Design a protein around this ligand. Sequence first.
Ligand SMILES: CCCCCCCCCCCCCCCNC(=O)[C@H](CO[C@H]1O[C@@H](CO)[C@@H](O)[C@@H](O)[C@@H]1NC(=O)CC)OP(=O)(O)OC[C@H](COC(=O)CCCCCCCCC)OC(=O)CCCCCCC
Ligand SMILES: CCCCCCCCCCCCCCCCCC(=O)N[C@@H]1[C@H](OC[C@H](OP(=O)(O)OC[C@H](COC(C)=O)OC(C)=O)C(=O)NCCCCC)O[C@@H](CO)[C@@H](O)[C@H]1O
Ligand SMILES: CC1C(O)C[C@@H](O)C(C)(C)[C@@H]1CC[C@@H](C)CCC[C@H](C)CCCC[C@H](C)CCC[C@H](C)CCC[C@H](C)CCCC(C)(C)O
Ligand SMILES: [Cu+2]
Ligand SMILES: [Cu+2]
Ligand SMILES: [Cu+2]
Ligand SMILES: [Fe+3]
Ligand SMILES: [Fe+3]
Lengths: 923, 98, 48, 48, 48
Amino acid sequence: RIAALERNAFSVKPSLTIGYSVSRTSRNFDVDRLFPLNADGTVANNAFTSGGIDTDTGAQRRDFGDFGNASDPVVAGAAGLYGFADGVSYTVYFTDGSTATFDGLNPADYKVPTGKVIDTTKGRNGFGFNNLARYKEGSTDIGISLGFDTSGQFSQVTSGTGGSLFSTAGRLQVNQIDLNFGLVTGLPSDAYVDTNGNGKKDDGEATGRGTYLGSGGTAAILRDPAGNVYRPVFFRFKNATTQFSVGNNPVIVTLGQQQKFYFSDYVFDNNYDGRGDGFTVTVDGSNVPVIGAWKPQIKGVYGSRSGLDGTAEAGYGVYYRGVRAQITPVGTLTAGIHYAQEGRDMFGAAQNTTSTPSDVTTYGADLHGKAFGVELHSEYATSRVRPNTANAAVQTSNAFYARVATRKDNLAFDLNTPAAKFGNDTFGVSLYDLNYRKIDAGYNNVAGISEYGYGSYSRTSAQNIAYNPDTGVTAPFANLDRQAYTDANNDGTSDRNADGTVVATNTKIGQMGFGVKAAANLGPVAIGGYYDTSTGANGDNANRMTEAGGSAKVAYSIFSLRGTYNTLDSNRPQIYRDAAGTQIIGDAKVRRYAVQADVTPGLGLFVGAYYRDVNVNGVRSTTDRGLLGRGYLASSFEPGVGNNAYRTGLRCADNNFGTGTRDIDGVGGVLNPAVNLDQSRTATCFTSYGVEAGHAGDNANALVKDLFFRVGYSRVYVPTTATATTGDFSGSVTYGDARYDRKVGVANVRLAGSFSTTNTQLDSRPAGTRGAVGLIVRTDPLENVPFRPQFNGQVGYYTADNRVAAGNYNANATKYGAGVVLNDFLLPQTKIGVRYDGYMAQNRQYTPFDGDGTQGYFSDANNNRRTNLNGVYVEGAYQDLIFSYGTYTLSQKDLNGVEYGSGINNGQPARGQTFKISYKVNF
Amino acid sequence: LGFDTSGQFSQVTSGTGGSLFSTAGRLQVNQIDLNFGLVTGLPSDAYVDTNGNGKKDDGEATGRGTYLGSGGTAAILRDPAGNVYRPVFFRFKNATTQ
Amino acid sequence: STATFDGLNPADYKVPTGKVIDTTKGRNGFGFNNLARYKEGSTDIGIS
Amino acid sequence: GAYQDLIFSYGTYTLSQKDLNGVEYGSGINNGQPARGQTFKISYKVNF
Amino acid sequence: RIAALERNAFSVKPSLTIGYSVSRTSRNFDVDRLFPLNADGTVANNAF
Ligand SMILES: CCCCCCCCCCCCCCCNC(=O)[C@H](CO[C@H]1O[C@@H](CO)[C@@H](O)[C@@H](O)[C@@H]1NC(=O)CC)OP(=O)(O)OC[C@H](COC(=O)CCCCCCCCC)OC(=O)CCCCCCC
Ligand SMILES: CCCCCCCCCCCCCCCCCC(=O)N[C@@H]1[C@H](OC[C@H](OP(=O)(O)OC[C@H](COC(C)=O)OC(C)=O)C(=O)NCCCCC)O[C@@H](CO)[C@@H](O)[C@H]1O
Ligand SMILES: CC1C(O)C[C@@H](O)C(C)(C)[C@@H]1CC[C@@H](C)CCC[C@H](C)CCCC[C@H](C)CCC[C@H](C)CCC[C@H](C)CCCC(C)(C)O
Ligand SMILES: [Cu+2]
Ligand SMILES: [Cu+2]
Ligand SMILES: [Cu+2]
Ligand SMILES: [Fe+3]
Ligand SMILES: [Fe+3]
């Protein structure tokens, strides 16, 4: 009886929040860039951060201000303190009484008055000024909330009797659901009233807190003169279950919304979203008497696209059906056939609009598996698309491939595992890939009824491969397209973007070709080779792209010597930069050959000498323009004895330098415990030659346990002026890195250092000297000295002499930070703590997140400005009551010393102060 | 109809906090004076305080007018079968501020 | 304004109100209510 | 049809009303076609 | 004490309905006039 009472009882969960807060600022800069970075790269926790960490948009705690109640993001350029503070953002008044906001330090540059608006002289001269000061008037807030949770025992459903011509028994199937429900008192700030059914908040839908006054917030509170507060009670629930399965042994029928299914690639790659609402039936004949050892299986799908959706949507009156059948006659070779169809009904043929084909009918067969020591992967498809309209003129498009290679479990092809193995280690000829491709030009995700895909995933990386992990397009080979200059509006000149990149028009050409990658394992020797030619579907050599190559390695004792030859002959246009540095579209010929020798004495040390020679379009081509990466079979070898693996990808980042110019911390990464500067490569294949010693601390029997350094020298070829055939190895790069953690006593030291003396502009790094050093100390609590002190520390210096074609400017930075925590302070359970941080910078800047996956970074700019961010943060604690105080100042002067901080132009820095009293309480 | 609670939620225990350090937690027990329950209908003097002053300004909301069917005779949320529906509110009063 | 005539011949619409005149907006002022009903296929989950 | 407790119901019906001549007035858009109705349902009763 | 707890306790009753439906017609006639009539005069049950 007690269990029955508990099953359908409410758990009452009240919550109380108590806290005092005051904050005064004049510019709202950011202070999270001063705090130490943890070994996982996260910044140390403080009581002043505004938050804002978003992985989707790349936002971090360092992209927003931390004072007042405002989280104003930092603004790049001069409007912000070069990414250090908030923008100036004048306000512009209009004649009709409307207003706009101008984001700049000079309103005169407001070059965007709308068509009919005229600046009315209402403010200073029609331009106002948005106040840069934010205030949080000191107050103590008590927040009270209450929720009612359920026992969570309603996770099952049992079927009931049904039928009209008959009556089912009932209680035959038990389904596990994922319903999470309870009672809430108040609505979240992000709730809304969805009046359209799209499931998303359109333009100002309802603001559910505004629909139910008194639900939450401060705008409305349903009160009582006696002091009572009333809040509406809502029933909140999530239903994560949309599929219901019936039947156990041979036959299982699943009914639900947005059914996800997969016949094969090129036909019903309809998982990762699903296609619509309906049912799927799966029949497994693995226990049949006569034929059950072949594991016969049948799948059948019926559904309506997107369920019910309004007209003008692609899935209105459109229904899909399909059936697949497969077996495994041999060890693992599964062979299957499948029929798929999608079409409009009489209500979709009329009043649907869009462009969905009147009918698509695809047939196919596949032979994936591993049977007799070899792995086969084949696929055939036929489309027969009915292109709506009136005449239609049904169009057919096939897609066939046959590959002898190893597919992973995620259906991506692993080209590093042979799958042939025609011998042992002494004589070990290994076939890695052997494939043919006949994808037609018109075969897209509509031809074979899928969600996405069947197009080059990169067009710059391996562009014959359609495999797209983002959209779940599991398909080995892609529908290639031909690229050409656009010339949309202007005539005579090709259209370009603002950055100068070309604008291309892509026409699908399909794909047809073959490719073999193999390697023969000798004894102390090993050899490998690859060949690959792909044309358009029609076979015209105007779209051919052939890559051939081969490598040979000899490794013995502690010496290894490799030699690689790579070619790329692309009559296919290809987009790339020329010698001058302007993007172009046109055929390419790349010839590379690299001989690199390595010696490993075994004491953790290593030495490496290399000579790599690129040759683009017949000229020596100081740097290849990424063309060699257009093929998916690169297959270089690796140094070391007994390492005869022919792994795909030309390891161009081997024994060469790094060209990074961005960093999370103020100093050039030498103060970031999540960045190993000695393992930073450029990943660009150069025409150069050089040597590089080093030392690894993770390798056992090393001189120093945790020590890594990467001293190295190199010389890079550069043409005579810009495009001359003649040239010389005039460029010179001398680089060095070091990293040493150690733990002397109770403290935990960490040293990092980097150097560079480049002579030319390699990828984006200018030509000049570049050095950096950083030290991090973190003492554990001392149990001998009174107060149990626990110290910290941080120092970082960065220097760079950027010799760019527009200046010879020096960009240096200096970051420091110290702090001591007293874990035993007078009264019991009393703690005190103080941390002082500082960051000075010459011509450097911060670039905030771009709103995409890219994050913000500190870089060098020629802005003649010196930033002087400083702050002190004192955190004391009684038993569990935390007093946090913080005072920070940001001043950005110029060479003269004008002190542009606090940009009202009064010669005063921006200042921020905060005081908080925090107290966490639980019921 | 009203729904009263057991009245056993008269205590709070502090939790660990701090950024430069971390307090032990469960160190202090505070006696609070929160009286809460569930009501079905609103009183006559209830109102929607849209300014924060805590007092009824000139015709603020007349909370019975905001939620029709809460109380009174002006509005009654009914059903042809004879059922009567009244919104459920979570009423609470906090007398503790220190 | 619009009205609905329930008959197989709109010419027999002997009931134009006091001041209303048939505007030649449809075929000749008379439309035609579609006789086709559609329930687009969907799977519905209702929770209470 | 019915599997354990999942009921598949399908129905196709046709209504044609001709005159003596054979004008086939059904589906009264006057195109000589009968009225037609088709339905497909999948029903599943579940209990907590 | 258990009886006192049960006297003023809530019984939580959740309900879930799952079902797929599609229907296409051009005139919307009636089909219940075709089904057999039961001994009590009611027409046989159907899913349409
Ligand atoms: C145990 C249950 C027994 C069966 C119950 C009675 C049903 C059979 C009687 C004939 C009834 C089925 C006859 C086939 C109609 N045809 C369909 O497929 C249409 C497809 O829509 C649209 O597609 C376009 C391109 O695709 C075009 O063709 C359009 O023109 C078409 N729309 C239109 O204009 C409407 C004709 O679906 P629908 O909207 O009519 O949906 C319902 C259908 C039919 O229902 C079933 O019978 C399925 C039962 C499967 C249970 C499998 C589970 C087994 C459990 C052990 O369901 C399908 O999907 C299947 C497709 C037909 C194959 C049938 C053989 C298993
Ligand atoms: C385990 C079991 C799982 C069960 C669930 C899976 C169900 C599998 C169903 C398999 C049925 C056989 C398929 C035959 C394939 C013929 C190959 C094929 O699809 N033909 C293509 C297409 O066809 C049109 C289609 O033909 P269709 O015969 O498919 O439909 C008839 C009937 C549907 O009945 C209803 C409900 O009205 O369905 C059946 C078979 O019962 C049709 O007439 N619809 C009129 C409307 C035209 C637009 C779709 O016309 C051209 C393009 O307009 C062209 O592109 C052709 O290549
Ligand atoms: C009968 C019965 C009963 O009444 C009482 C009691 O016995 C039961 C209840 C168990 C029962 C029910 C039994 C029930 C379970 C049904 C049996 C199960 C099987 C599974 C059904 C399907 C069998 C068909 C089979 C799967 C097809 C095989 C063909 C291959 C797919 C062909 C592939 C070839 C490809 C194209 C080559 C590659 C070519 C390219 C170019 C692509 O490389
Ligand atoms: Cu911040
Ligand atoms: Cu739809
Ligand atoms: Cu997929
Ligand atoms: Fe919406
Ligand atoms: Fe008020």
